[PDB]
RNA sequence: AUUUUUUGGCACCUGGACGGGAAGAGACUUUAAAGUGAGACGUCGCGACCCUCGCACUUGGUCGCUUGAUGUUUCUCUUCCCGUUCG
């Protein structure tokens, strides 16, 4: 069983997340509510659940006919994986 | 004939356009790998919303459930 | 009786042109021929074209269709497949 | 007796069906014949222990001199105060959503004792004032009606359209 | 605030009703009166019942260094001393752990 | 004031407790939990639904001075499907049946 | 799906997107996929607005909301 | 567990069920399945807006059931 | 006699929802009314009121009988039985 | 995997954020295998701007009010609950304690 | 984590305050004179005429609401008496 998990996280698409975790580089996760999160991956699983460090959350909100950016810094966070649209490797 | 997973395993190292079922977003990039659950890794990706590019992204991992279709790009 | 999977295998084997309706996108359809499928009802569609469609009084102006080429349409987006 | 926390906490709570006919759905809290005399330095702070939600509060036959300050209750749609010694009807003190109020056999003696019924919430549909001295007075019913014209029933007799249309003309 | 007095009169009604004192303490927890205030109320709760140790054991369950100090008092004044045996063993000063335990065996 | 329940109370302990069950379309179902399921399918006895009308929803905006008049349906014995539950909240404990009041 | 009692009978389905399809049930599936013969898209009372669909029609089961006899 | 078994015990009785669409159906439960699929016969249907209509027989897919209302007698069932 | 009073000669024209609620409100003054049961399809104009105690039921019998209730004068007497669906 | 990490956070204060944007501050008491949380001494909240966008947030505001805990008329619609059980599919994020030594929990 | 539940078709869209109601405006139909922001679902009831004589374990039919209130779809505001609250 679990040997397949160690295969898929090493060769398959989640090797990106794994590389970002091992090299400690931040990833720009993009969520289903159009929030971005910029964060370090500390752990993940096959559902793309994640434990994240130094989370910066970013989004726009609207006042009338114009938009104002909003921001949060969260020290430690867990992300349920069903909400992830895309994860981007920060250059 | 070509079944879905053999087909997608044939597009690896070729440029594909992954249209998402949401936000009218389509990611155009080189397909590097794919999961049995059809997760995708693209490289050299360009975000397009409604045909207007938001510029090159580098590497992206796209969760399987967001995908409407993958098309090969000639 | 034909099980639905066998009916899709008929579309595959006879190369019958099909129209596929999309799950929530009532305004769009895909026309093509299925060149493979799987137990999740993912489909590889060859000669696929997306067709603009009206929501009710649902005429289909194929003259404005956009050719996608060959696509893997994820099966969680299919609602109907028809000749 | 006077109000104390154990009295208000221990009070029998059980669902009744009288407002529905089929299902037991209204929590009825029972404080009957208990001879609670009122004391502002003991009662309202005890009533902060009255369980929430509750729907019928039955304070029948208790020695209260005025309607208890349940103004902070959104839930007590029925307040029973029969045989108590209430003398004045301050509509501020009723629950916010009280629908039925039962003042039978209290000690209300003049329309001046009723005058602040005008302040009662517009949710109040049912009133009973039987056995008060006030019920003997001339034009009593028309007075209560023009104080609170949105009653549907007063003293278990239906408020007809002509009674309401009279009461609202003042 | 007024609400304490509603329990105080109830204590004047029937002071040996343990559930009154318990609900009074519970309200003081929910509002969060200071430790030195709740100590005075727990010592009242014990003093009205000084013949029975069970209320001291509830007090110790809230006072849980003062819980060790009062436990040394409760050992000086035996099932609660048996309950203390794990705490007393960790003191390692053998006369202080062993004397209370042998006293509890003496009044077993 | 309100009911307190022990912190260890799993859903299996709340049988015969009257729950408020909150659901994905902004509605609440209130009834004694008779049984449940791995999915959180629930059986609610004597169930009553509440919803907030669109006329009242405005009163939830910023200025207990708000007083929402919900709309209710008495449903009766009801099976909720698990997909619809967002959350569950305890409203009340198992009461004595009014039979038990009867003196003789 | 113990759906056999509908077999070779005409049925009307309400399916995702408030769409409706009527036809002759020729087969069904564990996932409640169905096959319709003589299928028609229904969207009004006017037969000129309803569209005859293809000779064979497969409906993916998670789309079906209800399946009503005719 | 018990909730689906209760829907087996309701067979032969008039169930009322609401869909995710808001449509209501009320009728005799003639079949039911472990997925909460149901078959209703002699069915008072109702569009989400309240426009009533009537149907001889209907099958409803489990995924689309919001809740099912069951006769009060079954609160006495031995399941509980 | 018994926990259950029988009430008769109710005003037929009134809606039972009002009539049952107001019978609760009427009898609650003199007893802990545990149940008001009415079934006009089988017994028009009649209700069976179950009090907590015989002393309360007897005081209610002594005080509500003949009292006006929606204009029509109420009839009250002890029931032949308990209410079973209490 | 990582639900077995969350199972270790018992008796610790978390701010769960739901899919609909409601934030649940509270003491975490349980996490089922399917991420069903149980929390006590809870404070539900809706972020300020969401109360102005009723086409998206009317359902969220209605579910918050109908919890019956919104006796406070505080802005941002605070509701206080002694106990809540949250079905795991509704969780968007869990904001964890800052002092949590993640390594000891993950390893 | 793969169609039927839990690894997402979801997201874009002094003074303040509330409530009694009056007067005008507005809008549509009539021939200067009389009626009251559009069109429609349903539902609680209310009150009259039509069913039943009474001790059990869904009273029935029908009409007005010219408002008694209420929920929900689709289309295009000034002013004066006054009740009640807030700092």
From Swiss-Prot, chain A:
rRNA-binding keyword on record: no
Gene Ontology BP term (one): mRNA splicing, via spliceosome
Domain Sm residue range list: 14-91
Any one GO MF annotation of this record: RNA binding
GO CC terms: catalytic step 2 spliceosome; commitment complex; cytoplasm; cytosol; nucleus; pICln-Sm protein complex; precatalytic spliceosome; Prp19 complex
UniProt key word Transmembrane helix: no
Keyword annotations of the record: Cytoplasm, mRNA processing, mRNA splicing, Nucleus, Ribonucleoprotein, RNA-binding
Places the protein is found: Nucleus; Cytoplasm, Cytosol
Other facts noted in the record for this chain: Present with 799 molecules/cell in log phase SD medium.
Subunit description: Component of the Sm core complex, present in spliceosomal snRNP U1, U2, U4/U6 and U5. The core complex contains SMB1, SMD1, SMD2, SMD3, SME1, SMX3 and SMX2 (Sm proteins B, D1, D2, D3, E, F and G, respectively), and is probably a heptameric ring structure.
Family named by the database record: Belongs to the snRNP core protein family.
Name of this protein: Small nuclear ribonucleoprotein Sm D2
UniProtKB/Swiss-Prot annotation, chain H:
One GO cellular component, as annotated: commitment complex
Key words, A-Z: Cytoplasm, mRNA processing, mRNA splicing, Nucleus, Ribonucleoprotein, RNA-binding
Membrane-spanning intervals of the chain: none
Keyword hit for Nucleus: yes
Gene Ontology molecular function: any one: RNA binding
Sm domain location: 2-74
GO biological process, one term: spliceosomal snRNP assembly
Subcellular location, record wording: Cytoplasm, Cytosol; Nucleus
Family as reported in the entry's similarity comment: Belongs to the snRNP core protein family.
Subunit structure comment from the entry: Component of the Sm core complex, present in spliceosomal snRNP U1, U2, U4/U6 and U5. The core complex contains SMB1, SMD1, SMD2, SMD3, SME1, SMX3 and SMX2 (Sm proteins B, D1, D2, D3, E, F and G, respectively), and is probably a heptameric ring structure. SMD3 specifically interacts with SMB1.
Role noted for this protein: Plays a role in pre-mRNA splicing as a core component of the spliceosomal U1, U2, U4 and U5 small nuclear ribonucleoproteins (snRNPs), the building blocks of the spliceosome. Also binds telomerase RNA and is required for its accumulation.
Protein name, entry field: Small nuclear ribonucleoprotein Sm D3
Lineage of origin: Eukaryota, Fungi, Dikarya, Ascomycota, Saccharomycotina
UniProtKB/Swiss-Prot annotation, chain I:
Record-annotated disulphide pairs: none
Subunit text: Belongs to the CWC complex (or CEF1-associated complex), a spliceosome sub-complex reminiscent of a late-stage spliceosome composed of the U2, U5 and U6 snRNAs and at least BUD13, BUD31, BRR2, CDC40, CEF1, CLF1, CUS1, CWC2, CWC15, CWC21, CWC22, CWC23, CWC24, CWC25, CWC27, ECM2, HSH155, IST3, ISY1, LEA1, MSL1, NTC20, PRP8, PRP9, PRP11, PRP19, PRP21, PRP22, PRP45, PRP46, SLU7, SMB1, SMD1, SMD2, SMD3, SMX2, SMX3, SNT309, SNU114, SPP2, SYF1, SYF2, RSE1 and YJU2. Interacts with RDS3. Interacts with LEA1.
RRM domain span: 3-81
Taxonomic source organism: Saccharomyces cerevisiae (strain ATCC 204508 / S288c) (Baker's yeast)
Annotated localization: Nucleus
Name this protein carries in UniProt: U2 small nuclear ribonucleoprotein B''
Ribonucleoprotein recorded as keyword: yes
Gene Ontology annotations for the cellular component aspect, listed alphabetically: nucleus; Prp19 complex; spliceosomal complex; U2 snRNP; U2-type prespliceosome
Record flagged with keyword Nucleus: yes
GO molecular function, one term: U2 snRNA binding
General function of this protein: Involved in pre-mRNA splicing. This protein is associated with snRNP U2. It binds stem loop IV of U2 snRNA.
A GO BP entry: U2-type prespliceosome assembly
Keywords, in A-Z order: mRNA processing, mRNA splicing, Nucleus, Ribonucleoprotein, RNA-binding
Miscellaneous field: Present with 504 molecules/cell in log phase SD medium.
Gene that this polypeptide is encoded by: MSL1
From Swiss-Prot, chain J:
Swiss-Prot/TrEMBL keywords: Cytoplasm, mRNA processing, mRNA splicing, Nucleus, Ribonucleoprotein, RNA-binding
Ranges for domain Sm: 1-100
GO process terms (BP): 7-methylguanosine cap hypermethylation; mRNA 5'-splice site recognition; mRNA splicing, via spliceosome; spliceosomal complex assembly; spliceosomal snRNP assembly; U2-type prespliceosome assembly
GO cellular component, one term: U4/U6 x U5 tri-snRNP complex
Keyword Cytoplasm appears in the UniProt entry: yes
Principal location class: nucleus
Compartment(s) where it occurs, according to its Swiss-Prot or TrEMBL record: Nucleus; Cytoplasm
Alphabetized GO MF terms: mRNA binding; RNA binding
Subunit note: Component of the Sm core complex, present in spliceosomal snRNP U1, U2, U4/U6 and U5. The core complex contains SMB1, SMD1, SMD2, SMD3, SME1, SMX3 and SMX2 (Sm proteins B, D1, D2, D3, E, F and G, respectively), and is probably a heptameric ring structure.
Note in the entry: Present with 2400 molecules/cell in log phase SD medium.
Family from the record: Belongs to the snRNP core protein family.
Biological role: lays a role in pre-mRNA splicing as a core component of the spliceosomal U1, U2, U4 and U5 small nuclear ribonucleoproteins (snRNPs), the building blocks of the spliceosome. Also binds telomerase RNA and is required for its accumulation.
Record's comment describing the protein's domains: C-terminal extension may function as a nuclear localization signal (NLS).
Name under which the protein is recorded: Small nuclear ribonucleoprotein Sm D1
Organism (species): Saccharomyces cerevisiae (strain ATCC 204508 / S288c) (Baker's yeast)
Encoding gene per record: SMD1
Shown stretch of the complete protein: 2 to 108 of 146
């Amino acid at each position: 069983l679990e040997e397949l998990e160690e295969f898929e996280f090493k060769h398959g698409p989640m090797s990106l997340i794994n590389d970002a975790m091992v090299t400690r580089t931040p990833v720009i996760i993009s969520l289903r509510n159009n929030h971005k999160i910029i964060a370090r991956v500390k752990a993940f699983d096959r559902h793309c659940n994640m434990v994240l460090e130094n989370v910066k959350e970013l989004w726009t909100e609207k006042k009338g006919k114009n938009v104002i950016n909003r921001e949060r810094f969260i020290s430690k966070l867990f992300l349920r994986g069903d909400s992830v649209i895309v994860v981007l490797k920060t250059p | 004939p070509v079944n879905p997973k053999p087909f997608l395993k044939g597009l690896v190292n070729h440029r594909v356009g992954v249209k998402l079922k949401f936000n009218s977003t389509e990611y155009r990039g080189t397909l590097v790998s794919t999961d049995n659950y059809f997760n995708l890794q693209l490289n050299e990706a360009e975000e397009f919303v409604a045909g207007v590019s938001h510029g090159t992204l580098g590497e992206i991992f796209i969760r399987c459930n967001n995908v409407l279709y993958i098309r090969e790009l000639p | 009786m034909v099980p639905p999977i066998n009916c899709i295998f008929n579309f595959l084997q006879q190369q019958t042109p099909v129209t596929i309706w999309l799950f929530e996108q009532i305004g769009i359809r895909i026309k093509g021929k299925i060149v493979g499928f799987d137990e999740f009802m993912n489909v590889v569609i060859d000669e696929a074209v997306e067709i603009p469609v009206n929501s009710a009084d649902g005429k289909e102006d194929v003259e404005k269709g956009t050719p996608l080429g060959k696509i893997l349409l994820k099966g969680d987006n299919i609602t109907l497949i028809t000749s | 007796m006077k109000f104390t926390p154990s009295i208000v906490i221990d009070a029998p709570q059980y669902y009744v069906d009288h407002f529905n006919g089929k299902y037991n759905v209204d929590k009825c809290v029972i404080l009957r014949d208990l001879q609670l005399e009122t004391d502002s330095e003991s009662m309202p702070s005890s009533l902060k222990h009255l369980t929430k939600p509750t729907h019928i509060l039955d304070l029948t036959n208790n020695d209260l001199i005025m309607i208890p300050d349940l103004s902070r209750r959104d839930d007590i749609h029925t307040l029973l105060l029969g045989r108590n010694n209430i003398v004045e009807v301050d509509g501020r003190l009723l629950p916010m959503n009280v629908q039925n109020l039962t003042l039978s056999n209290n000690s209300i003696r003049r329309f001046e004792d009723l005058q602040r019924l005008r302040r009662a919430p517009r949710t109040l549909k049912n009133l009973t004032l039987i056995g008060n001295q006030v019920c003997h007075l001339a034009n009593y019913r028309e007075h209560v009606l023009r104080l609170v014209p949105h009653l549907e029933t007063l003293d278990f007799q239906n408020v007809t359209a002509e009674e309401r249309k009279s009461a609202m003309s003042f | 605030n007024d609400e304490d007095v509603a329990f105080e009169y109830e204590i004047q009604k029937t002071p040996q009703n343990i559930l009154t004192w318990k609900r009074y303490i519970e309200y003081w927890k929910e509002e969060g009166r200071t430790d030195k205030q709740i100590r005075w109320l727990y010592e009242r709760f014990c003093s009205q019942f000084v013949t029975d140790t069970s209320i001291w054991e509830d007090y110790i369950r809230w006072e849980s260094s003062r819980i060790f100090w009062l436990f040394q008092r409760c050992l000086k004044s035996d099932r609660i001393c048996l309950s203390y045996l794990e705490l007393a063993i960790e003191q390692y000063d053998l006369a202080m752990i062993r004397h209370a335990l042998a006293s509890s065996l003496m009044k077993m | 004031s309100k009911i307190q329940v022990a912190h260890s109370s799993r859903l299996a302990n709340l049988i015969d407790y009257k729950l408020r069950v909150l659901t994905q379309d902004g509605r609440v179902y209130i009834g004694q939990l008779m049984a449940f399921d791995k999915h959180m399918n629930l059986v609610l006895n004597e169930c009553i639904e509440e919803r907030v009308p669109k006329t009242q929803l405005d009163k939830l905006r910023p200025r207990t001075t708000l007083n929402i008049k919900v709309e209710k349906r008495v449903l009766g014995l009801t099976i909720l499907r698990g997909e619809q539950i967002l959350s569950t909240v305890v409203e009340d404990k198992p009461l004595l049946s009014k039979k038990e009041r009867l003196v003789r | 799906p113990e759906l056999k009692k509908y077999m070779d009978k005409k049925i009307l389905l309400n399916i995702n997107g408030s769409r409706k399809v009527a036809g002759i049930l020729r087969g069904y599936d564990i996932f409640l996929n169905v096959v319709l013969d003589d299928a028609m898209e229904i969207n009004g009372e006017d037969p000129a607005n309803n569209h005859q669909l293809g000779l064979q029609t497969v409906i993916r089961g998670n789309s079906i909301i209800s399946l009503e006899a005719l | 567990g018990i909730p689906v078994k209760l829907l087996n015990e309701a067979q032969g009785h008039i169930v009322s069920l609401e869909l995710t669409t808001g449509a209501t159906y009320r009728g005799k439960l003639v079949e039911s399945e472990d997925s909460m699929n149901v078959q209703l016969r002699d069915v008072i249907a109702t569009e989400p807006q309240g426009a009533v209509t009537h149907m001889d027989q209907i099958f409803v897919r489990g995924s689309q059931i919001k809740f099912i209302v069951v006769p009060d007698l079954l609160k006495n069932a031995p399941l509980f | 006699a018994k926990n259950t009073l029988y009430v008769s000669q109710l005003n037929e024209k009134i809606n039972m929802q009002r009539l049952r609620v107001n019978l609760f409100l009427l009898f609650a003054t003199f007893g802990e009314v545990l149940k008001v049961s009415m079934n006009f399809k089988k017994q028009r104009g009649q209700a069976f009121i179950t009090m907590r105690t015989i002393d309360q039921a007897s005081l209610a019998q002594i005080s509500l009988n003949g009292e006006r209730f929606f204009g029509k004068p109420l009839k009250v007497e002890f029931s032949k039985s308990e209410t079973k669906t209490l | 995997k990582l639900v077995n990490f969350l199972k270790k956070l018992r008796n610790e204060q978390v701010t769960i954020e739901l899919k609909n944007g409601t934030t649940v501050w509270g003491t975490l008491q349980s996490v089922s295998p399917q991420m069903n949380a149980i929390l006590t001494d809870v404070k539900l909240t809706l972020p300020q701007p969401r109360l102005n966008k009723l086409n998206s947030n009317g359902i969220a505001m209605a579910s918050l009010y109908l919890t019956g805990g919104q006796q406070p008329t505080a802005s941002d619609n605070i509701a206080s609950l002694q106990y809540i059980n949250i079905r795991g599919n509704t969780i968007r994020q869990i904001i964890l304690p800052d002092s949590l030594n993640l390594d000891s929990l993950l390893v």
